[PDB]
C-alpha cells in the first residue's frame, strides 16, 4: 500500500464524520491504523533551501502505533518517499550535520483505512477541522494519469464531492 516514489491523491474537508464513517462502511473499508497522534517535525536549511525547491522533509512520530518515518516530499505535490527509522534523534542529528534543522511542527490525529488498492486517510487538526484523502502510491511516473483519474472515480463513488476539495497541504493551510 505504500510502495513507490509518487503518491497520487485527492483531499477533501469533511463536514460530517458520522456520514464519512457510513461512507467507509458502504465501501467495506478495513482499518490500517486508527486514531494516531502524528507529530511532524519539518526540517530545512538556514535559508529555507528545500522550501524554495518545493521540497518538504519531515521526521514523523506516530503514537501509539510507535512508527517513526523519515519523509521527503516534492519537488511539488506528487513526489513522496518515506523510510522507516528506529531512532528519530539519531537521524535528526545526522540531518543537522548536513545543515537541516527543525523549522516548524505540524500535529494531527490520523486514521488510515484501505479499500482495495486505495488508502483513505482521515485527519483532524486543531484549528482547521477534519479532512479525508483518497490516495494510491506508484513507482511509475508513466501511470500518474491513469491513477489520478482512478482516484477521482473512487472519490465520486465514495461520496466525496468537488465542493469540499482542499488542494493545499497542511503546511500551506497553516502558513509554514
Ligand X SMILES: Nc1ncnc2c1ncn2[C@@H]1O[C@@H]2COP(=O)(O)O[C@H]2[C@H]1O
Contact footprint for Mn ion (CB under 5 A) = 135
Distances 3 to 25, 135, 143, 144 between C-alpha atoms, Å: 25, 12, 14, 14
Please list, in sequence order, all residues whose beta carbon lies within 8 angstroms of the beta carbon of residue 30, skipping any fewer than 6 positions away.
113, 114, 115
C-alpha distance from residue 76 to each of 52, 128, 129 (Å): 11, 23, 24
Among the listed ranges 19-27, 66-74, 150-158, 167-175, the one in contact with its own copies (CB under 8 A) is 66-74
* 6 flagged as catalytic: no
d(CA 124, CA 27): 21
Which residues are near ligand X by CB under 6 A? 2, 7, 67, 69, 71, 80, 82, 112, 135, 137
CB of 28 to ligand X, least distance (A): 20
Find the shortest distance in angstroms from Cβ 93 to its own copies.
Answer: 6
Stretch that binds its own copies, among 11-19, 30-38, 67-75, 119-127 (CB under 8 A): 67-75
Q: Which is nearer to its own copies, 111 or 169 (CB)?
A: 169
Identify whether the C-beta of residue 68 lies closer than 8 Å to the C-beta of residue 61.
Answer: yes
Residue in 42, 100, 113, 170 annotated catalytic: 42
Neighbours of 118 (CB within 10 A): 22
Query: Are 31 and 85 in contact, with CB atoms under 8 Å apart?
Result: no
Q: What is the DSSP code (8-state) at residue 76?
A: S
Residue with cell 537521524: 91
- Known binding residue 168? Answer is no
Nearer to Mn ion (CB atom), residue 41 or residue 45: 41
| 152 assigned binding-site residue | no
Report which residue's Cβ sits closest to ligand X: 2
Catalytic residue positions, numbered:
42
- Residue ranges of the annotated binding site for 3',5'-cyclic AMP are 2, 60, 73, 80, 110, 137
- Residue ranges of the annotated binding site for Mn(2+) are 7, 9, 119, 133
- Residue ranges of the annotated binding site are 2, 7, 9, 60, 73, 80, 110, 119, 133, 137
Amino acid at each position: 500500500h505504500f510502495v513507490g516514489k509518487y503518491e497520487v491523491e485527492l483531499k477533501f474537508r469533511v463536514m460530517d464524520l458520522t456520514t464519512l464513517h457510513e461512507q467507509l462502511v458502504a465501501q467495506k473499508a478495513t482499518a490500517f491504523t486508527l486514531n494516531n497522534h502524528e507529530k511532524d517535525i519539518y526540517l530545512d536549511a538556514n535559508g529555507q533551501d528545500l522550501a524554495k525547491q518545493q521540497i518538504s522533509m519531515v521526521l514523523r512520530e506516530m503514537n501509539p502505533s510507535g512508527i517513526r518515518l523519515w519523509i521527503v516530499k516534492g519537488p511539488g505535490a506528487e513526489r513522496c518517499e518515506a523510510s522507516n527509522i528506529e531512532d528519530v534523534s539519531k537521524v535528526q542529528s545526522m540531518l543537522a550535520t548536513l545543515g537541516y534543522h527543525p523549522a516548524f511542527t505540524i500535529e494531527k490525529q490520523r486514521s488510515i483505512y484501505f479499500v482495495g488498492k486505495f488508502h483513505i486517510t482521515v485527519d483532524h487538526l486543531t484549528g482547521l477541522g477534519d479532512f479525508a484523502e483518497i490516495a494510491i502510491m506508484t513507482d511509475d511516473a508513466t501511470e500518474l494519469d491513469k491513477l489520478k483519474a482512478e482516484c477521482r472515480d473512487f472519490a465520486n463513488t465514495f461520496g466525496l464531492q468537488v465542493d469540499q476539495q482542499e488542494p493545499r497541504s497542511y503546511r500551506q493551510l497553516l502558513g509554514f
